[PDB]
Tab-separated table of C-alpha atoms and ligand atoms in Angstrom:
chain	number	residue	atom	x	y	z
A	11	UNK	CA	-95.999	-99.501	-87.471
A	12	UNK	CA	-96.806	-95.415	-87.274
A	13	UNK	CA	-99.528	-93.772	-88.490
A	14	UNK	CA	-98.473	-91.275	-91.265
A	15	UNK	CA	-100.771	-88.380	-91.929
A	16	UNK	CA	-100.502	-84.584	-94.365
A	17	UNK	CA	-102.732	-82.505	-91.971
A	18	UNK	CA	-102.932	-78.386	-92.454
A	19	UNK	CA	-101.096	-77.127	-89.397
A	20	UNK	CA	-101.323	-73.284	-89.390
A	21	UNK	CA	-101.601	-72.764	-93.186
A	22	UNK	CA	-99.540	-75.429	-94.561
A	23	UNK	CA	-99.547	-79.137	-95.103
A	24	UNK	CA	-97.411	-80.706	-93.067
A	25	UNK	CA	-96.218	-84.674	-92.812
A	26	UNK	CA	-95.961	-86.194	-89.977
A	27	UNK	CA	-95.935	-89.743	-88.565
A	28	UNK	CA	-96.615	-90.507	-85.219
A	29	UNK	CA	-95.641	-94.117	-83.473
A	30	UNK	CA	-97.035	-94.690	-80.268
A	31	UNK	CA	-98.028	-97.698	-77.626
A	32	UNK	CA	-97.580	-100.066	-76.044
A	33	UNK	CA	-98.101	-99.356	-72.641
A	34	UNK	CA	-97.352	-95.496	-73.388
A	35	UNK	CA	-95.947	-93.509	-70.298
A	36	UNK	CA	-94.850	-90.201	-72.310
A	37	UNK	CA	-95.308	-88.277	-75.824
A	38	UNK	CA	-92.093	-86.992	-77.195
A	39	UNK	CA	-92.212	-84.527	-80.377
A	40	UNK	CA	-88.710	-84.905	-82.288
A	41	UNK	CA	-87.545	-81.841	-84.448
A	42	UNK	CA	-85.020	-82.523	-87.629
A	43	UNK	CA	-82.672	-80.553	-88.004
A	44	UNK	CA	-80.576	-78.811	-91.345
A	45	UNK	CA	-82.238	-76.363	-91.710
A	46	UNK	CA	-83.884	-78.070	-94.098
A	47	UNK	CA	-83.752	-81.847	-93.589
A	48	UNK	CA	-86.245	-84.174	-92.844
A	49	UNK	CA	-87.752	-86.306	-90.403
A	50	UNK	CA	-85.774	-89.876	-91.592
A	51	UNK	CA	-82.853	-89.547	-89.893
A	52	UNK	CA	-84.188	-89.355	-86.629
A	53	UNK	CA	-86.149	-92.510	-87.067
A	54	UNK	CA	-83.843	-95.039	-85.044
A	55	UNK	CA	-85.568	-93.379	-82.003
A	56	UNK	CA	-88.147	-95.293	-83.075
A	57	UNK	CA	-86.619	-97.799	-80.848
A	58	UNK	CA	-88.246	-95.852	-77.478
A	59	UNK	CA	-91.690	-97.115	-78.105
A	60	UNK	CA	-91.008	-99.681	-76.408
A	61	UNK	CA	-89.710	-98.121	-73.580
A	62	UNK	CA	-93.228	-96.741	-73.722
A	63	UNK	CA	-92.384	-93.693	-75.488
A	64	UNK	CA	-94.684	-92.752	-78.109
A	65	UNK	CA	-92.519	-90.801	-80.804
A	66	UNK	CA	-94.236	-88.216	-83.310
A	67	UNK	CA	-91.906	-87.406	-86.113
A	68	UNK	CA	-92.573	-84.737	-89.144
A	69	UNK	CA	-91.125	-82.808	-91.569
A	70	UNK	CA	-91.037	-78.640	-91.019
A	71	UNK	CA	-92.145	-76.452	-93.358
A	72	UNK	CA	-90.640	-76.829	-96.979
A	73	UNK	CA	-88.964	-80.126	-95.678
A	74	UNK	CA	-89.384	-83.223	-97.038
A	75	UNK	CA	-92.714	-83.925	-97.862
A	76	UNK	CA	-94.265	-81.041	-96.375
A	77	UNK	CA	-95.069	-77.998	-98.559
A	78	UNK	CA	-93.306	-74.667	-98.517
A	79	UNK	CA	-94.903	-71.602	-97.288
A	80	UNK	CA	-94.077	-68.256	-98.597
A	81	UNK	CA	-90.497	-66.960	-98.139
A	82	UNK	CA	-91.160	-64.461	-95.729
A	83	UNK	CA	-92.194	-67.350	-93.036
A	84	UNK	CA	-88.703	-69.298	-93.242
A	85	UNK	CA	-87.556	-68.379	-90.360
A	86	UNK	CA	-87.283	-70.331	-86.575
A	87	UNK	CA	-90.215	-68.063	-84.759
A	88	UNK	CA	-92.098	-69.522	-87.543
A	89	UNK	CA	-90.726	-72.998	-87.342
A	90	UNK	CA	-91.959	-72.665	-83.397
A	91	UNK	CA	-95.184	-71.544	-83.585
A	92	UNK	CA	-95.327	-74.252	-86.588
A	93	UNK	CA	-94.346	-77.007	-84.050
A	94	UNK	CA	-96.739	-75.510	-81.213
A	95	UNK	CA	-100.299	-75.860	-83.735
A	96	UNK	CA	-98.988	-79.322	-84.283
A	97	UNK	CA	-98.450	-80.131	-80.867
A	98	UNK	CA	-101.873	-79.034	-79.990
A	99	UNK	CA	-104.080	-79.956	-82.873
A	100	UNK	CA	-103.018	-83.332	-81.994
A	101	UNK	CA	-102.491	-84.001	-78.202
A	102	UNK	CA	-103.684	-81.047	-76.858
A	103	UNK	CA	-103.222	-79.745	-73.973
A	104	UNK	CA	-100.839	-82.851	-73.276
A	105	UNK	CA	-97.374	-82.145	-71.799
A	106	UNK	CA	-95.267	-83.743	-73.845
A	107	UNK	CA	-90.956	-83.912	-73.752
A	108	UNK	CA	-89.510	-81.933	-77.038
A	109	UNK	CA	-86.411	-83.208	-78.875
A	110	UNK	CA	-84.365	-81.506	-81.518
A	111	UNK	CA	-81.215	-83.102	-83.236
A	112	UNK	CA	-78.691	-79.450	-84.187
A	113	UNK	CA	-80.831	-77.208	-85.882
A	114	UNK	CA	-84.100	-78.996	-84.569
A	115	UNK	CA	-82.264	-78.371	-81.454
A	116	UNK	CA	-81.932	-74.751	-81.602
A	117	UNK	CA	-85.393	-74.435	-82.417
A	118	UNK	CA	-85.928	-76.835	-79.399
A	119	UNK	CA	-84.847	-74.298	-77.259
A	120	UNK	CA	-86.376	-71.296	-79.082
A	121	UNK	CA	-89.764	-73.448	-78.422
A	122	UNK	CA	-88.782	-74.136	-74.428
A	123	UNK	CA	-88.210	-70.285	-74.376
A	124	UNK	CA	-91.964	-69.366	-75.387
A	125	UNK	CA	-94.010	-72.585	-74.137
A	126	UNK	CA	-92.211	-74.952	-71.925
A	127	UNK	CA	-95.136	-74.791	-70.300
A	128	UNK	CA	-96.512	-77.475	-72.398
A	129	UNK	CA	-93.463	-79.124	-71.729
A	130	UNK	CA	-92.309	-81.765	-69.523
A	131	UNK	CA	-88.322	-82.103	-70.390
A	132	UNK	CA	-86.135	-80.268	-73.300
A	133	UNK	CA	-83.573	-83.004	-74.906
A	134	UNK	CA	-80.973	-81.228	-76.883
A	135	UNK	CA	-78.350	-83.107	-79.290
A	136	UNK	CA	-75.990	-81.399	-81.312
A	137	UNK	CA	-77.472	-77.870	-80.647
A	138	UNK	CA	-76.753	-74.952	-80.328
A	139	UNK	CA	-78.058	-71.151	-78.859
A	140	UNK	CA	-75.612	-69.140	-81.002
A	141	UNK	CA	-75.290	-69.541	-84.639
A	142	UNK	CA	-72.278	-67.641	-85.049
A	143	UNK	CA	-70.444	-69.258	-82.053
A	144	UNK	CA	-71.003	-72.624	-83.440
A	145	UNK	CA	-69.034	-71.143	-86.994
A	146	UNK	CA	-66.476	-70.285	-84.512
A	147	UNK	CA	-65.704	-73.530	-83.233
A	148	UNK	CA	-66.222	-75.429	-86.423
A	149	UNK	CA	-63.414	-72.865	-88.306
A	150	UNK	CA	-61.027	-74.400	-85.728
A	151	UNK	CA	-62.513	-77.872	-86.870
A	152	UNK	CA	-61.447	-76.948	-90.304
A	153	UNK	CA	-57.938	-75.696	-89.241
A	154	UNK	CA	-57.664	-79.221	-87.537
A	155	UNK	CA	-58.165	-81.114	-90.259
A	156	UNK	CA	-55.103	-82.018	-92.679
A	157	UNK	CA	-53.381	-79.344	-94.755
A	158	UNK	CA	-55.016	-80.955	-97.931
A	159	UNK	CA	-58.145	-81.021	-96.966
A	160	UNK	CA	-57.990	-77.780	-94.993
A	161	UNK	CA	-56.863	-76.026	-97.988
A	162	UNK	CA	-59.416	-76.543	-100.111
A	163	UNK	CA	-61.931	-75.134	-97.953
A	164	UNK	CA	-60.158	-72.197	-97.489
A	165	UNK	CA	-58.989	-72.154	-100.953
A	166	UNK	CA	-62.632	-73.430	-103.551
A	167	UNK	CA	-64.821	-72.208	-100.425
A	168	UNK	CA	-63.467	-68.414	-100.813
A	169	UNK	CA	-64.134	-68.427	-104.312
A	170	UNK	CA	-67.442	-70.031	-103.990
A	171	UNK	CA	-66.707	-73.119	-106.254
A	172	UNK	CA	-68.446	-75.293	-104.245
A	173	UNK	CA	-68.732	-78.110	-107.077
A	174	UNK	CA	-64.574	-78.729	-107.176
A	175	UNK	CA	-64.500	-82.112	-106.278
A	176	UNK	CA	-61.158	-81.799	-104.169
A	177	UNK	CA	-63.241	-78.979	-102.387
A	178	UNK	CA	-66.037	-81.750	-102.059
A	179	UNK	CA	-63.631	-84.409	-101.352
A	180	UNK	CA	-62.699	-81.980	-98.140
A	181	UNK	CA	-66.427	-82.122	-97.304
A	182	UNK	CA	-67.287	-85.360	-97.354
A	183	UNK	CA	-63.587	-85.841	-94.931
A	184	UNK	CA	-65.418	-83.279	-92.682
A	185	UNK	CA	-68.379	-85.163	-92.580
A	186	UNK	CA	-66.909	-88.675	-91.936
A	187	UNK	CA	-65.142	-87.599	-89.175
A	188	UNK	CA	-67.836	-84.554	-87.821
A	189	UNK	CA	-71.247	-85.594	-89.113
A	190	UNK	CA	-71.538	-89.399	-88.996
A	191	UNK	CA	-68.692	-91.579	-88.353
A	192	UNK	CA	-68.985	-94.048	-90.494
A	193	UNK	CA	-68.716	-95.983	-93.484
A	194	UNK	CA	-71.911	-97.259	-94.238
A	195	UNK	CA	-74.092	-94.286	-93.637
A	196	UNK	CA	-77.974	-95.470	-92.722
A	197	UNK	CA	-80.527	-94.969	-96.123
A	198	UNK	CA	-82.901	-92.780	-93.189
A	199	UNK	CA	-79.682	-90.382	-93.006
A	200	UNK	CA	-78.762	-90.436	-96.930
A	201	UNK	CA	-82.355	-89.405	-97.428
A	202	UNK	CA	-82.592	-86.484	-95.319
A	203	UNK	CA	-79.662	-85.212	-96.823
A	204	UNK	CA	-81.349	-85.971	-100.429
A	205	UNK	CA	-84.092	-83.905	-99.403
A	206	UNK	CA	-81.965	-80.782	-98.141
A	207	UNK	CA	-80.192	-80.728	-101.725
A	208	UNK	CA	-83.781	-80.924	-103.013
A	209	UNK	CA	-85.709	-78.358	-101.057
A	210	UNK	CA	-84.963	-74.701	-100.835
A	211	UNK	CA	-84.991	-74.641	-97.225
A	212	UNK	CA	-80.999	-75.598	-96.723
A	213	UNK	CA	-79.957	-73.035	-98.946
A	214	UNK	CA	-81.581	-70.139	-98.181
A	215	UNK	CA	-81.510	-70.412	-94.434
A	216	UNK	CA	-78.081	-71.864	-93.924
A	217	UNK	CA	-76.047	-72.296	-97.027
A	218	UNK	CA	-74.436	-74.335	-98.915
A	219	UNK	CA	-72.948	-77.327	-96.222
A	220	UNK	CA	-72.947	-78.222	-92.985
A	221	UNK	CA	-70.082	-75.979	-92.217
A	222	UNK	CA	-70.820	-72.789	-94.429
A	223	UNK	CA	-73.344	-71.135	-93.055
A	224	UNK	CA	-74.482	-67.664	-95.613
A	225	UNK	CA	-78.045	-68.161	-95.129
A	226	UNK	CA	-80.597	-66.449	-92.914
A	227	UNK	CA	-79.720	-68.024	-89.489
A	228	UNK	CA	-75.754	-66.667	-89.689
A	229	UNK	CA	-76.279	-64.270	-86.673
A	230	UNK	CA	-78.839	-66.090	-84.924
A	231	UNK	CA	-78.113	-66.051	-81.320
A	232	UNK	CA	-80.499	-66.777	-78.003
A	233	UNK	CA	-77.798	-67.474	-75.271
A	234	UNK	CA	-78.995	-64.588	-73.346
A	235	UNK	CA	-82.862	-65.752	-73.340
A	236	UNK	CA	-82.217	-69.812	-72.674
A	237	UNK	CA	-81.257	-69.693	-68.643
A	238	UNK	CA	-85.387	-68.958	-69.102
A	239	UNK	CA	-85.491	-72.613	-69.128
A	240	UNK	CA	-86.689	-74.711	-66.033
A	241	UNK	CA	-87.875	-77.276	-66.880
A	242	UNK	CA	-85.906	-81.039	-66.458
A	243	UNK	CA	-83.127	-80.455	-69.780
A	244	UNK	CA	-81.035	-83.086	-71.244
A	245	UNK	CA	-77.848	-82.193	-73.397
A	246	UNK	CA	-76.090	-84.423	-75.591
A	247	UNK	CA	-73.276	-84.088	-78.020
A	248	UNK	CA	-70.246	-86.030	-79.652
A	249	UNK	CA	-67.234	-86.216	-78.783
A	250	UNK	CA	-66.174	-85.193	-82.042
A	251	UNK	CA	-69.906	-83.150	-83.288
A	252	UNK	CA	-69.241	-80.474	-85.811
A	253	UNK	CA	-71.139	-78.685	-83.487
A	254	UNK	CA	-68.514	-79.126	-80.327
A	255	UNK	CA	-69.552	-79.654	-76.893
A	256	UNK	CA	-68.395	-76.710	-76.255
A	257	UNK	CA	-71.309	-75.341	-77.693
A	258	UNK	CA	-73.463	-77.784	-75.707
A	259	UNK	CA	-71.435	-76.673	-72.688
A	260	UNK	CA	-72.596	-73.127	-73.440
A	261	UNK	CA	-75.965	-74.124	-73.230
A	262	UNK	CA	-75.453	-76.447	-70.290
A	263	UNK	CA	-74.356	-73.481	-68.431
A	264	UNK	CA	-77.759	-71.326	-68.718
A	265	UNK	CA	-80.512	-74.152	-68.153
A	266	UNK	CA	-79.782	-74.542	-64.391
A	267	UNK	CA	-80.403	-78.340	-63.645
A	268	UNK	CA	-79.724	-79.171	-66.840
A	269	UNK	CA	-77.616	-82.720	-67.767
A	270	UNK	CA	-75.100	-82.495	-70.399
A	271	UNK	CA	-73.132	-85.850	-71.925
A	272	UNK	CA	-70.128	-86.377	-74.545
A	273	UNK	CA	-70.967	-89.205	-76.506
A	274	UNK	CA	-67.246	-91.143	-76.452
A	275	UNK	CA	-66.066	-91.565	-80.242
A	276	UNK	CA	-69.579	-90.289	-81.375
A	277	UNK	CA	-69.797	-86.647	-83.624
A	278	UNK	CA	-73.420	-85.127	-84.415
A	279	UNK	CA	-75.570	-87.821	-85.171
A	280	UNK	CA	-75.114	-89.817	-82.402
A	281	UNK	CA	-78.747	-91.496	-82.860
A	282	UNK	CA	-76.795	-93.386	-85.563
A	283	UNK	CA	-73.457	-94.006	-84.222
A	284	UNK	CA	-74.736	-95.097	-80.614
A	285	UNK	CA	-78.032	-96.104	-81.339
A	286	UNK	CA	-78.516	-98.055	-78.175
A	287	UNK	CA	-76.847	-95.690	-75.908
A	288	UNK	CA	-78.323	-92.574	-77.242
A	289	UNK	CA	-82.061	-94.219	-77.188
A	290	UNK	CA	-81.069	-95.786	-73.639
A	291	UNK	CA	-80.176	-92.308	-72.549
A	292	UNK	CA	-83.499	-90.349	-73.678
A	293	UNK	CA	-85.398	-93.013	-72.574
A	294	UNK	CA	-83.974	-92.854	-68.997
A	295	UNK	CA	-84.135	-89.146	-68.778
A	296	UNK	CA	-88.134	-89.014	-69.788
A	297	UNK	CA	-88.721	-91.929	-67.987
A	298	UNK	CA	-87.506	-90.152	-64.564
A	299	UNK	CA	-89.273	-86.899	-65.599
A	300	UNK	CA	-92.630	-88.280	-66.027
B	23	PHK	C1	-77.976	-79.546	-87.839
B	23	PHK	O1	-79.235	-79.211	-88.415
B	23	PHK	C2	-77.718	-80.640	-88.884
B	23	PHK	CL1	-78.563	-82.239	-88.624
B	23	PHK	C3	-76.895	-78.525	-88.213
B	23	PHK	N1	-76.844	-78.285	-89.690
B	23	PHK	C4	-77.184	-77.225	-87.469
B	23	PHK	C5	-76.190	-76.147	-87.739
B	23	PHK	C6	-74.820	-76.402	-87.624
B	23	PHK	C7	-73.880	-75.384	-87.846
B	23	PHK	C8	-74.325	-74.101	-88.186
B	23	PHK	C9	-75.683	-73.841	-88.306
B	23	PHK	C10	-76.617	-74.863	-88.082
């Protein structure tokens, strides 16, 4: 079992749950991504604890059950120095390895860029350093996917009618075959995405889906700053991730040393649709890095 907490970081109350033991060789601090998710999708690397990996998990600011801080702090600097208070009002001054799944790993790397120091590996899955390079590769996504569906993006998504249900219908397609692929999506994932509907956080920093992105983050962009990055990086992306790996491969290029794999028939949340290979990966890579 984990212990949960709802500690004040920096000014807010943030949830997190940390699972460690037995026999622990390494700390690794997992970031959610959305914007505005939560924490309980990324629980099947739960599994790595015993690999001896402890795992801390929690929910950023205005996500999930953590509270919202003013307006004016939703924004990744703030999501950074947010994960830095937590890393060291709990372990610290620990190195520990830093994980982030998309978003989380965008902010992953915006965290590596200011204190890797405190760091002793990056993982990155599904990330990205450039916002508005990521739109560009999932437009062609879009233009991929059958006329019908295709359509209605183009068509309900111009007009902002994003409750059409053939326009939703098109979403949920994308989703299947760019978010998870599969059928019987995991309760930890169906809840995250509960909780981005719910919060305020999804909508006012990215938008209104995976794949329309309107909110505050539309022109971020830290390609330029990453190749800052020394420490022992580990890539990872689907084969078919909404967020391509030619993205990843973007990233790849800057962090010299880095590692980047294309999860076979995976998409973005590869924790889910290779749960043994993705946790078998991570756990190698931090194991070697220790
Ligand atoms: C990941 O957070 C989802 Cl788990 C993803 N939304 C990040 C993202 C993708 C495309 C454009 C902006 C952000």
């Amino acid at each position: 079992e984990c212990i949960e907490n709802y500690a004040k970081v920096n000014g807010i109350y943030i949830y997190y749950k940390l699972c460690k033991a037995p026999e622990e060789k390494a700390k690794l601090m997992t970031m959610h991504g959305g914007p505005g998710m939560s924490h309980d999708y990324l629980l099947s690397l739960r599994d790595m604890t015993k690999e001896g990996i402890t795992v801390l998990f929690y929910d950023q600011f205005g996500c999930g059950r953590s509270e919202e801080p003013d307006q004016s702090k939703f924004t990744i600097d703030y999501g950074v120095e947010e994960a830095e208070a937590l890393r060291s009002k709990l372990f610290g001054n620990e190195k520990v390895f830093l994980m982030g799944s998309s978003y989380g790993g965008a902010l992953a790397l915006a965290y590596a860029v200011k204190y890797q120091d405190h760091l002793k590996g990056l993982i990155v899955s599904g990330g990205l350093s450039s916002v508005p390079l990521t739109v560009k590769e999932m437009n062609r996504l879009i233009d991929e996917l059958p006329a019908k569906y295709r359509d209605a993006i183009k068509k309900y998504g111009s007009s902002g009618s994003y409750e059409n249900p053939e326009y939703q219908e098109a979403v949920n397609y994308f989703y299947h075959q760019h978010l998870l692929r599969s059928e019987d999506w995991p309760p930890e994932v169906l809840k995250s995405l509960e909780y981005a509907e719910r919060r305020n956080v999804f909508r006012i920093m990215n938008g209104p889906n995976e794949f329309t992105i309107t909110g505050t983050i539309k022109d971020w962009d830290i390609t330029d700053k990453i190749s800052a990055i020394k420490i022992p990086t580990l890539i990872t992306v689907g084969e078919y991730d909404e967020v391509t790996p030619n993205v990843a491969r973007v990233i790849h290029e800057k962090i010299a040393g880095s590692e980047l794999h294309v999860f076979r028939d995976c998409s973005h949340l590869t924790m889910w649709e290779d749960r043994e290979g993705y946790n078998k990966l991570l756990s190698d890579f931090i194991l070697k890095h220790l």
